[PDB]
Design a protein around this motif. Structure first.
Motif, PDB file in Angstrom:
ATOM      1  N   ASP A 202      -6.516  -6.313  -4.889  1.00 48.92           N
ATOM      2  CA  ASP A 202      -5.521  -6.210  -3.802  1.00 48.92           C
ATOM      3  C   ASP A 202      -6.150  -6.500  -2.430  1.00 48.92           C
ATOM      4  OD1 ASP A 202      -3.592  -5.662  -5.683  1.00 48.92           O
ATOM      5  OD2 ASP A 202      -3.422  -3.530  -5.238  1.00 48.92           O
TER       6      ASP A 202
ATOM      7  N   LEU B 198     -10.435  11.280  -6.848  1.00 45.58           N
ATOM      8  CA  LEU B 198     -10.323   9.829  -6.670  1.00 45.58           C
ATOM      9  C   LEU B 198      -9.613   9.458  -5.356  1.00 45.58           C
ATOM     10  CD1 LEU B 198     -10.757   6.950  -7.984  1.00 45.58           C
ATOM     11  CD2 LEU B 198      -8.536   7.270  -9.082  1.00 45.58           C
ATOM     12  N   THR B 199     -10.265   8.655  -4.515  1.00 43.91           N
ATOM     13  CA  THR B 199      -9.611   8.142  -3.306  1.00 43.91           C
ATOM     14  C   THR B 199      -9.231   6.694  -3.554  1.00 43.91           C
ATOM     15  OG1 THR B 199     -10.917   9.623  -1.866  1.00 43.91           O
ATOM     16  CG2 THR B 199      -9.678   7.845  -0.763  1.00 43.91           C
ATOM     17  N   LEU B 200      -7.958   6.385  -3.326  1.00 42.58           N
ATOM     18  CA  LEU B 200      -7.458   5.015  -3.451  1.00 42.58           C
ATOM     19  C   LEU B 200      -6.883   4.529  -2.142  1.00 42.58           C
ATOM     20  CD1 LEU B 200      -5.740   5.039  -6.980  1.00 42.58           C
ATOM     21  CD2 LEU B 200      -8.106   4.262  -6.398  1.00 42.58           C
ATOM     22  N   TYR B 201      -6.991   3.225  -1.937  1.00 36.64           N
ATOM     23  CA  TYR B 201      -6.273   2.516  -0.899  1.00 36.64           C
ATOM     24  C   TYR B 201      -5.485   1.429  -1.610  1.00 36.64           C
ATOM     25  CZ  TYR B 201      -9.582   4.986   2.098  1.00 36.64           C
ATOM     26  OH  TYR B 201     -10.368   5.961   2.675  1.00 36.64           O
ATOM     27  N   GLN B 202      -4.538   0.832  -0.882  1.00 30.78           N
ATOM     28  CA  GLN B 202      -3.675  -0.279  -1.336  1.00 30.78           C
ATOM     29  C   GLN B 202      -2.470   0.211  -2.120  1.00 30.78           C
ATOM     30  OE1 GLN B 202      -3.739  -3.664  -0.732  1.00 30.78           O
ATOM     31  NE2 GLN B 202      -5.724  -3.947   0.280  1.00 30.78           N
TER      32      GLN B 202
ATOM     33  N   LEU C  43     -11.232   2.078   3.628  1.00 38.66           N
ATOM     34  CA  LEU C  43     -11.867   0.908   2.986  1.00 38.66           C
ATOM     35  C   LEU C  43     -11.504  -0.404   3.689  1.00 38.66           C
ATOM     36  CD1 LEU C  43     -13.745  -0.208   0.654  1.00 38.66           C
ATOM     37  CD2 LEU C  43     -11.657  -0.381  -0.698  1.00 38.66           C
TER      38      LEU C  43
ATOM     39  N   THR D  15      -2.109  -0.738  -5.681  1.00 35.94           N
ATOM     40  CA  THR D  15      -3.142  -0.062  -6.478  1.00 35.94           C
ATOM     41  C   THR D  15      -2.661   1.342  -6.856  1.00 35.94           C
ATOM     42  OG1 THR D  15      -5.059  -1.393  -5.829  1.00 35.94           O
ATOM     43  CG2 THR D  15      -5.524   0.858  -6.487  1.00 35.94           C
TER      44      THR D  15
ATOM     45  N   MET E 121      -7.869  -2.103  -6.779  1.00 39.99           N
ATOM     46  CA  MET E 121      -8.118  -1.922  -5.352  1.00 39.99           C
ATOM     47  C   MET E 121      -8.887  -3.101  -4.738  1.00 39.99           C
ATOM     48  SD  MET E 121      -9.698   1.451  -3.345  1.00 39.99           S
ATOM     49  CE  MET E 121     -11.343   1.212  -4.050  1.00 39.99           C
TER      50      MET E 121
END
Ligand SMILES: N[C@H](CCC(=O)N[C@@H](CS)C(=O)NCC(=O)O)C(=O)O
Ligand SMILES: N[C@H](CCC(=O)N[C@@H](CS)C(=O)NCC(=O)O)C(=O)O
Ligand SMILES: C=C(CC)C(=O)c1ccc(OCC(=O)O)c(Cl)c1Cl
Ligand SMILES: C=C(CC)C(=O)c1ccc(OCC(=O)O)c(Cl)c1Cl
Ligand SMILES: [Ca+2]
Ligand SMILES: [Ca+2]
Ligand SMILES: [Ca+2]
Ligand SMILES: [Ca+2]
Ligand SMILES: [Ca+2]
Ligand SMILES: [Ca+2]
Lengths: 209, 208
Positions: free
Chosen positions: B93, A60-64, A48, A67, B90
């Motif tokens: 951030d 679920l894909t997360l970045y940060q 992202l 987060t 997300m």
């Protein structure tokens, strides 16, 4: 779950969320991205914000990194007891992030020339977290409230790496000193911190700490 | 009862102010001058030695994003779901990372740094365009189909980048339309046209 951590072969910005998962009895997969693989471009391009960590929680894909912390805090009940405590947890976490960002800038951009100044400024940057502990059950429980929160794992990591950068920086802060020992001794966290998956990684990417 | 304590600039309070205005909320502005700040008393009593400070009745908060999340939680601007909550975080951030780069430019390296920053900017904006494209054709909000605290922070980020680099949103149809659509929300429209917004500089040092 299942949980998958996708990151460089370092502790870095995944250290806290890993301690959190370990302490909460959770398992997860480490997916390792080398400098060589990263510079190839594909994964970066598909990320992202062009950066790691990338985190998978089932579909679920997360970045940060923060987060990820907040997500795990929300889903695992590590976010205080009510809305007001949630706000204090956020406040502590945002404070930790500001110091982490300063730490990283030192490590990456200006270690040799900047270390002296950074270390002089360190007590004043650490004192707020001592003050917060003093204001919560005499510093005897957690950073906010009477239950562990995601902010605890993040603050703990921050303190660990600063003891490495500046051995003895916590000696002037009895509540922070005792807090590091008390949290590190939690049996599942104790196991993890002694394990090769933690011990055999460097803190940062460039050989400095 | 809301009170914002800050320097006389838009800065890190611009987003939470838009949020409060668009949500039909009142609040007091307490202004701290450069001269007062340098006196030392408020800086020493502040948790992290910085502003903004926010009062919500008996609760004192610091940290702009803490304030945003608090208002988002207490006013129902945090997604419909735990999963949407994570997507809201997300985005926020991501907004904060660019805001941090923006502030570094403004404060430490404006003149020598601007050219490099502006060349890098399309790649820094692209992710928010992509997020919009994946949510109801970019026709609603950044996450889900209700406004969140991340929307106000993203909107602010976009508004200040159009000042820094006019026409930076021209290549991003969804971001460009989003700025207009949110800016047209009646209560937000009024606030953005008001003296309390218009008569403040974006930053403290005369640059934008
Ligand atoms: N906002 C940060 C961004 C993380 C970040 O700075 N990522 C670094 C490693 S810790 C990275 O992917 N750098 C490689 C690159 O930018 O190409 C977070 O909390 O996750
Ligand atoms: N982590 C930031 C910190 C805010 C900050 O950088 N404050 C600046 C103005 S926006 C400040 O109080 N500087 C004065 C000083 O450090 O003495 C937040 O989100 O609120
Ligand atoms: C965590 C970090 C060190 C403080 C960090 O930001 C970082 C950035 C790029 C990296 O490699 C990829 C590359 O080739 O740039 C690596 Cl391994 C790290 Cl650890
Ligand atoms: C990000 C900022 C706001 C856009 C910022 O860095 C900042 C820092 C110090 C400031 O004054 C206090 C002083 O005498 O330094 C002011 Cl007015 C600002 Cl706006
Ligand atoms: Ca494993
Ligand atoms: Ca593996
Ligand atoms: Ca709990
Ligand atoms: Ca001593
Ligand atoms: Ca006033
Ligand atoms: Ca709502």
């Amino acid at each position: 779950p299942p949980y998958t951590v996708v990151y460089f072969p370092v502790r870095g910005r995944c250290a806290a969320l890993r301690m959190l998962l370990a302490d909460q009895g959770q398992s997860w997969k480490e997916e390792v991205v080398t400098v060589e693989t990263w510079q190839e471009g594909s994964l970066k391009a598909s990320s992202l914000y062009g950066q790691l960590p990338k985190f998978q929680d089932g579909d679920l894909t997360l970045y940060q990194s923060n987060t990820i912390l907040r997500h795990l805090g929300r889903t695992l009940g590590l976010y205080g007891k009510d809305q007001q405590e949630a706000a204090l947890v956020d406040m502590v976490n945002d404070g930790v992030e500001d110091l982490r960002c300063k730490y990283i800038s030192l490590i990456v951009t200006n270690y040799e020339a900047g270390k002296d100044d950074y270390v002089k400024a360190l007590p004043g940057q650490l004192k707020p977290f001592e003050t917060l502990l003093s204001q919560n059950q005499g510093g005897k429980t957690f950073i906010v409230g009477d239950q562990i929160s995601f902010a605890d794992y993040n603050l703990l990591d921050l303190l660990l790496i600063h003891e490495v950068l500046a051995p003895g920086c916590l000696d002037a802060f009895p509540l922070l000193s005792a807090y590091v020992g008390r949290l590190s001794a939690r049996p599942k966290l104790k196991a993890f911190l002694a394990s090769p998956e933690y011990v055999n990684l460097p803190i940062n990417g460039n050989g400095k700490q």
